[PDB]
Design an enzyme around this catalytic site. Structure first.
Site, short mmCIF file in Angstrom:
data_model
loop_
_atom_site.label_atom_id
_atom_site.label_comp_id
_atom_site.label_asym_id
_atom_site.label_seq_id
_atom_site.Cartn_x
_atom_site.Cartn_y
_atom_site.Cartn_z
N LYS A 1 21.28 31.99 -34.77
CA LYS A 1 22.50 31.19 -35.67
C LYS A 1 22.40 32.19 -36.83
O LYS A 1 22.03 31.99 -37.64
CB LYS A 1 22.04 30.09 -37.02
CG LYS A 1 23.36 29.51 -37.72
CD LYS A 1 24.12 28.54 -37.30
CE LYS A 1 25.16 28.21 -38.19
NZ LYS A 1 26.31 27.18 -37.24
N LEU B 1 43.52 18.70 -27.50
CA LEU B 1 43.52 19.33 -25.75
C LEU B 1 44.28 20.56 -26.82
O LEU B 1 44.32 21.96 -26.26
CB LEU B 1 44.48 19.00 -25.31
CG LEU B 1 44.10 17.61 -23.94
CD1 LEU B 1 43.49 18.76 -23.15
CD2 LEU B 1 43.10 16.73 -24.42
N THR C 1 26.41 22.21 -33.30
CA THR C 1 24.50 22.28 -33.96
C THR C 1 24.04 20.43 -33.09
O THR C 1 22.62 21.60 -32.24
CB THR C 1 24.22 22.07 -35.03
OG1 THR C 1 24.92 22.84 -35.53
CG2 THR C 1 23.40 21.81 -35.50
N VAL C 2 24.59 19.72 -32.36
CA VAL C 2 23.91 18.31 -31.77
C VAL C 2 23.84 18.93 -30.55
O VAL C 2 23.27 18.75 -29.85
CB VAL C 2 24.60 17.15 -32.41
CG1 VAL C 2 25.52 16.89 -32.17
CG2 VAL C 2 23.59 16.00 -32.05
N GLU D 1 24.78 29.66 -31.53
CA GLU D 1 25.65 29.38 -32.42
C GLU D 1 26.86 29.41 -33.31
O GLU D 1 26.13 30.13 -34.16
CB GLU D 1 25.42 27.96 -33.37
CG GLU D 1 26.19 26.81 -33.54
CD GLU D 1 25.50 25.13 -34.38
OE1 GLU D 1 26.71 24.74 -35.49
OE2 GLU D 1 24.34 25.29 -34.18
N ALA E 1 28.26 9.06 -30.42
CA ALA E 1 28.40 9.43 -31.13
C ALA E 1 27.12 8.97 -31.90
O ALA E 1 26.50 7.82 -31.59
CB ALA E 1 29.72 8.11 -31.79
C1 LIG Z 1 52.55 13.60 -31.85
C2 LIG Z 1 52.46 12.94 -31.19
N1 LIG Z 1 52.15 11.72 -32.55
C3 LIG Z 1 51.14 11.50 -32.59
O1 LIG Z 1 50.58 11.11 -33.30
N2 LIG Z 1 50.21 12.73 -32.30
C4 LIG Z 1 51.15 13.43 -31.41
C5 LIG Z 1 50.43 14.46 -31.49
C6 LIG Z 1 50.20 15.32 -29.66
C7 LIG Z 1 49.32 15.53 -30.29
C8 LIG Z 1 47.94 15.48 -28.62
C9 LIG Z 1 47.17 15.19 -28.59
C10 LIG Z 1 45.64 16.43 -28.13
O2 LIG Z 1 46.75 17.54 -28.06
O3 LIG Z 1 44.27 16.21 -28.02
MG LIG Z 2 26.43 23.25 -37.17
#
Ligand SMILES: C[C@@H]1NC(=O)N[C@@H]1CCCCCC(=O)O
Ligand SMILES: [Mg+2]
Ligand SMILES: C[C@@H]1NC(=O)N[C@@H]1CCCCCC(=O)O
Ligand SMILES: C[C@@H]1NC(=O)N[C@@H]1CCCCCC(=O)O
Ligand SMILES: [Mg+2]
Ligand SMILES: [Mg+2]
Ligand SMILES: [Mg+2]
Lengths: 225, 226, 230, 228
Positions: free
Chosen positions: C41, C150, C20-21, C112, C202
Site C-alpha cells: 500500500k 457499469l 482492501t477486502v 492496492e 456483503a
Molecule cells: C437515468 C437512470 N435513472 C436512474 O435511476 N439511473 C439511471 C442512470 C443510468 C445508470 C446506469 C447504471 C450503471 O451505469 O451501472
Molecule cells: Mg482500502
C-alpha cells in the site's frame, strides 16, 4: 411504413385511452408499438398523455417534442409562454424516424383534426399526408357526435387521408338511449373498430389488457402491420 | 452550423438534470432560445421525469425525448427487462440535429455517466456527440472520489476527440468542509469550472431558481455558447 | 518456474468499493493454494481516522509481508492529505522500488491503490496506472454491484487500455443477499465486459479469520488463482 | 327567390343559434327590414324547447315558420324514430322556406344542431338546403375550448359546397373573459369575420333590453346590407 394518426372529434374524447388500448392489444398480438405525442399542453396540471399510455399499455417508445404549462390549444399555450411551436419538419422527421419493420406507430395530436400543431397553421392532417398515415378517429357516443364525426371524416377525405375507422372512447355502463342510436348511426357511417368501456382509463394493467384484447378485432389490428 | 452542448456527468445522481435547468435558465435570461433533449429516461414508476424537472425550474418548453422505461436501471437493462429495445443511434442524432437552429442553445442530457449505452448497437452519449460535433459539459460532485471519476471521464472525452466545455459542480455543500473546498481547487486545476450550483437548488421555485441561475454562470460564457 | 513475482495492481472504480477486502480475500485464497503473498500500500491516507489498509489485510488474511511507504493523516486525496500535513507526495521511483524490493520467484504481490485508478500518487500527475506500466503489472479492478457501476468500470477499463496495462479481471467488492434486480443485471452486464473473478458477500470484511478464509477459497476460481504465478 | 335567405348554423347544439336568430332579427327589424324566421326541424319539445316561440318572445317577430316537431332532445332522426314519426321530405323544407318568399325580406333559417345534422332522408343537411335556396350561412360558435377545431371544420364543409359564409357570431360572450375565451376570440377573428358576440345571459333579457343589446351587438351597416 405503418403509421396511424389517432385524431378525434375534439378534446377529452378518448384519444389517449384508445392509443393505450390499441397499443395494449397490438402488443398482445406481438406487434411492436411506438406512441408519439409531439406537442403536450397542460403540464402545470399534470397532463402527460405519454405517461398514461406507458402505465396502461406498457409501451416504452414514447416520443415528444414540446410541452406547455397552460392548458389551452398549443398555439395559445405557446404564445402564453412567449415561445413558438415546433416546426412541421421536426414533427414529421420525428414520427418517420420512429417507424420500424413490424412496428405500429400511433400519433396523437392535441384536440381535433384541425388544431394547429406546428407553424404556420400545420395540423395533424398535414402530418398524416406527409407520413402517409391513415387516420383513426375517436368519437363520443353522446349528443353531437354524428355531426362532429361526419365533419372530421370529410376533412380527412378532402386531403385523401384514409380513415382506418372509428372508436368510441367511452361506451356507457347503463348504455343509454342517445348513445345506442348514436352507435347504430356511426356504424352505418363507418367501421366502428372498438368501443371502450366507460372507465377503461382507471383500470389496472391486467384489467386494461384483457379489456383491450377484447375491445378490438384481433384480425383487423394484426393486419395493421 | 450547430450549437449543441451535450451535458454529461461522472455518474447518475450528480446534478446533470439541475445543471441543464440552470444553464437553460441563465441562457433564457440572456435572451437565448433553449431546447432540451433527453432521448432516454428510466425510472418512470419512481416517477422520474427530468424534462418535466427542466420545464418547471427553467420554463423551457422545447423538451424532446424518445423512450421512457419504468424500471430504475441503466437504459439497456431497463430495456431488456421490458422486452423492448432502445432507440437507434440515428434516431437520437437526427432528433438532436432537428432541435438545433441559429441562436438556439440545444442541450442534451444522457442517462447516468458518459459511457452508458443509450442506443443500439452499443451507442453512448459520446458516440452521439461525435456524430453531432458537440462539445460536452461535465457535471461533477464535490465529494471524495470526484477527482478520479472526473479525470476518468475527461480522458474518455479526449479519446474520441470530443471537446470538454468545462465542469459544473452539481451540488455545492454548506458549509463546504475540508474535502469539498480542496476538491473545488483541485477541479479548477484540471478544468474550467463554469459553475458550482448550491446544494438544494433543485427544490427552489422557478423565480428563485432563475435568480440563482443568473448568478451561477458567467453571462459572457453563456452568450458565447451561441 | 517463474523466476520473478507476479504483480497485480488492485485498483477500483473508486474509494469505498472493497479494494482492501478483495486484496485480503485474494491473498487468503492464494495462500491456501500454496502461493506466498505480499501486499503493498504505497499511499495510505486517513491514518488520523485510523485508516490502515495494510493492518486490515493482516487481520483478515493473516498476511504479514505488508509493505507501506506514505501515510497521511487526513482522509482525502493523497495530494491534499499531503498538503494538509505539510508533507510531500512520494516519487514515482520510491513507489516502484517499494514494489520491486518484494520480488521473489512465484510470489504473488498485490498493490492496492488509493481510491480509483487516476488518483495522483506522486508528482506530477503520477497514478497507479503509470506504476503498473513501470513494474509490468496486470490490473485487478474492484467494482460495486450498484447503479453507476457499469459506467465507472468501463471508464476504468478504457483508461487501463490506453496505456496497455492488461486486465486480470473484475471483482465485485460487496455482493448483497439476496440480490435485487439492479444488482443481478449489473452482474450480468459486468460479465459481458470482462472476466468477473469473484463477488465477495456483503459484510466479508467483518468475518473471523476462519470464516474469511473459507469465504475467500469459495469466492475465486481455483484454476485462476493457481495460474497466477506459473 | 326574391328574398335574401341566411341559414344560421352552429358548431353543435346549445351554442346560441336561436338567440343569435333572435338578436339578428331584432337588429334587422330596427333597420327597417321585414324579417321572417324559420325552424324546419325542431326537437326537444319534451324538455320545453320551442326555438320559434323563443324568437317571438325575445325579438317580437310574428312570421315564424315551422314544420317538423319532435319530443325528445335527440338528433332529428332519432327523435323522429322514438316518436314513431318520419323526418320531413327535402322538398318540404325547401317549400317551407320558399313560401316565405317576399321581395325585400330577410329570412333566417335555423338548423338543428350543427351543419351536418340530417334534417331529411337520406342524409340531407342544412348545407344541402342552403344550396337549394341559394342561402349564405351564418356560423354560431362558443368561445370555449374546442371552438377553433369545430369552426374550421364547419367553415371548410361550407366552402366544399360553395356555400357563402356570412360570418361568425359568438353565442355567449363572458363579460370578464378568461384567458382561453379571449384567446379564442382573437383566433376566430383571424379565420373569419366575427359579426357579433352576444353578452352571456342575452336570452333572459326583456324585449326592450334585448332590442338595445341587439342593435349594439351587430354592425348596423352589415345588417342593413343583408337584403342589399
Ligand atoms: C437515468 C437512470 N435513472 C436512474 O435511476 N439511473 C439511471 C442512470 C443510468 C445508470 C446506469 C447504471 C450503471 O451505469 O451501472
Ligand atoms: Mg482500502
Ligand atoms: C484513504 C482516504 N480515506 C478515505 O476514506 N478515502 C481516502 C482515499 C481516497 C482518495 C480519492 C480521491 C478522489 O478521486 O477524489
Ligand atoms: C391539451 C390541452 N389540454 C386540454 O385540456 N385541452 C388542450 C388540447 C385541446 C386544444 C383544443 C383547441 C381548439 O380546438 O380550440
Ligand atoms: Mg389525450
Ligand atoms: Mg436527471
Ligand atoms: Mg336553437
Amino acid at each position: 411504413m405503418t403509421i396511424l394518426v389517432v385524431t378525434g372529434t375534439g378534446t377529452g374524447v378518448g384519444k389517449t385511452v384508445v392509443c393505450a388500448a390499441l397499443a395494449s392489444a397490438a402488443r398482445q398480438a406481438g406487434i411492436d408499438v411506438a406512441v408519439c405525442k409531439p406537442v403536450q399542453t397542460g403540464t402545470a396540471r399534470g397532463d402527460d398523455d405519454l405517461a398514461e399510455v406507458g402505465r396502461l399499455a406498457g409501451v416504452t417508445q414514447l416520443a415528444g417534442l414540446a410541452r406547455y404549462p397552460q392548458p389551452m390549444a398549443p398555439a395559445a399555450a405557446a404564445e402564453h409562454a412567449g415561445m413558438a411551436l415546433p416546426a412541421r419538419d421536426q414533427i414529421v422527421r420525428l414520427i418517420a424516424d420512429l417507424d420500424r419493420p413490424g412496428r405500429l406507430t400511433l400519433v396523437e395530436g392535441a384536440g381535433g383534426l384541425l388544431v394547429e400543431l406546428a407553424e404556420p397553421g400545420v395540423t395533424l392532417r398535414d402530418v398524416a399526408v406527409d407520413v402517409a398515415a391513415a387516420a383513426l378517429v375517436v368519437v363520443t357516443a353522446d349528443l353531437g357526435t354524428l355531426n362532429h364525426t361526419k365533419l372530421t371524416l370529410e376533412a380527412l377525405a378532402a386531403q385523401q387521408v384514409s380513415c382506418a375507422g372509428l372508436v368510441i372512447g367511452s361506451w356507457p355502463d347503463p348504455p343509454g338511449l342517445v348513445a345506442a342510436s348514436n352507435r347504430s348511426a356511426l356504424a352505418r357511417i363507418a367501421m366502428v373498430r372498438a368501443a371502450l368501456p366507460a372507465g377503461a382509463a382507471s383500470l389496472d394493467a391486467g384489467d386494461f389488457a384483457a379489456m383491450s384484447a377484447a375491445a378490438f378485432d384481433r384480425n383487423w389490428v394484426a393486419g395493421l402491420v
